[PDB]
Amino acid sequence: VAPTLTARLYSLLFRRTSTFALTIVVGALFFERAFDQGADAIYEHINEGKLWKHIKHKYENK
């Protein structure tokens, strides 16, 4: 007898107003790192070789 996934989520994070707000705070924090890293990767790939970070090595040498 194993309950569905949304069922476990309801009981574990959504039912209590405290726990439901915690989940959104923590969720947003994880979502933020993953989304920015992913989107930045997509943007840089679409523009591979054109951005300063891509050609920078050619002019530095601190």
Binding site: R16, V25, L29
Partner: peptide
């Protein structure tokens, strides 16, 4: 009563909010 446990998750939310958001 349920206020401690609810005040403690409200506690946590603010904290994680600030921490992250700020």
């Amino acid at each position: 009563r349920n206020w401690v446990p609810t005040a403690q998750l409200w506690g946590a939310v603010g904290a994680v909010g600030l921490v992250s958001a700020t």
